[PDB]
C-alpha cells in the first residue's frame, strides 16, 4: 500500500 | 500537500506520522488512528470498507 | 458514491442536501455547512482556501 | 461550481 511520513526522524 | 486529501477517522486535517492512502478513493489516513502500518499489501479506508476501527 | 469523497467541516460522512465540490481537491461539502449555494461560479474548500466558516 | 442533490424533493 502507499504510505508516507513527511517529517521523519533521521539518525544522520 | 494541497492536492492530497486527508480524511482520517480522527477528523483532524493534519499531516502527522506514518500515513496510508486508500487504494480506491485516494484519501490519506493516519496509520495509528486506523490500526495499520506500512506492512499491509493493500489498504481501503473505513468508508470504502466499513468496519469497526 | 464510493469514488466520491465527502469531506465537510461538519465531519459527517453523509450525502445530504445540496452539496458542492471543491474545484481543486474534488471533495464534496454540504452547502449549508459552508455557507454557499449553487449560485457561486467557483468553489474551494476550507483547506484549499482557509477562512472562517 | 459543481453541485448535486441526490434525494431532491420533486413536485411530480
Ligand atoms: Zn487520524
Ligand atoms: Zn476509500
Ligand atoms: Zn457538512
Ligand atoms: Zn479543496
Residue numbers in the entry:
A (entry chain T), D (entry chain P): 1 to 12
B (entry chain A), C (entry chain B): 1 to 53
Paper quotes:
The histone H3K36-specific methyltransferase ASH1L plays a critical role in development and is frequently dysregulated in human diseases, particularly cancer. ASH1L itself functions as a specific methyltransferase: it methylates lysine 36 of histone H3 producing mono- and di-methylated epigenetic marks H3K36me1/214,15. There is no information available about the N-terminal 2,000 amino acids of ASH1L, though several domains have been identified in the C-terminal part, which contains the catalytic SET (Su(var), E(z), Trithorax) domain, followed by a bromodomain (BD), a plant homeodomain (PHD) finger and a bromo-adjacent homology (BAH) domain. We find that ASH1LPHD recognizes H3K4me2/3, whereas the neighboring ASH1LBD and ASH1LBAH have DNA binding activities.
To gain insight into the molecular mechanism of the recognition of H3K4me3/2, we co-crystallized ASH1LPHD with H3K4me3 and H3K4me2 peptides and determined a 1.3 Å resolution crystal structure of the ASH1LPHD:H3K4me3 complex and a 1.9 Å resolution crystal structure of the ASH1LPHD:H3K4me2 complex. The H3K4me3 peptide occupies an extended, shallow, negatively charged binding site of the domain. Backbone chains of histone residues R2-K4me3 pair with the existing β-sheet of ASH1LPHD, forming the third anti-parallel β-strand, and the side chains of the peptide residues make additional intermolecular contacts. These include hydrogen bonds between the guanidino group of R2 and the side chain carbonyl of Q2601, between the hydroxyl group of T3 and the hydroxyl group of S2618, and between the hydroxyl group of T6 and the carboxyl group of D2595. Additionally, the N-terminal amino group of A1 of the peptide is restrained through the hydrogen bonding contacts with the backbone carbonyl groups of V2620 and E2621 of the protein. The trimethylated K4 is bound in the hydrophobic cage, formed by I2586, M2599 and W2608 and surrounded by the negatively charged residues D2584 and D2595. W2608 makes a cation–π contact with the trimethylammonium group of K4 and is critical for structural stability of ASH1LPHD, as mutation of W2608 to alanine disrupts the protein fold. The D2595K mutant lost the ability to interact with H3K4me3, likely due to the electrostatic repulsion of the positively charged K4me3 group. The structure of the ASH1LPHD-H3K4me3 complex overlays well with the structure of the ASH1LPHD-H3K4me2 complex (rmsd of 0.1 Å), as well as with the structure of the ING2PHD-H3K4me3 complex (rmsd of 1 Å), pointing to a conserved mode of the methyllysine recognition.
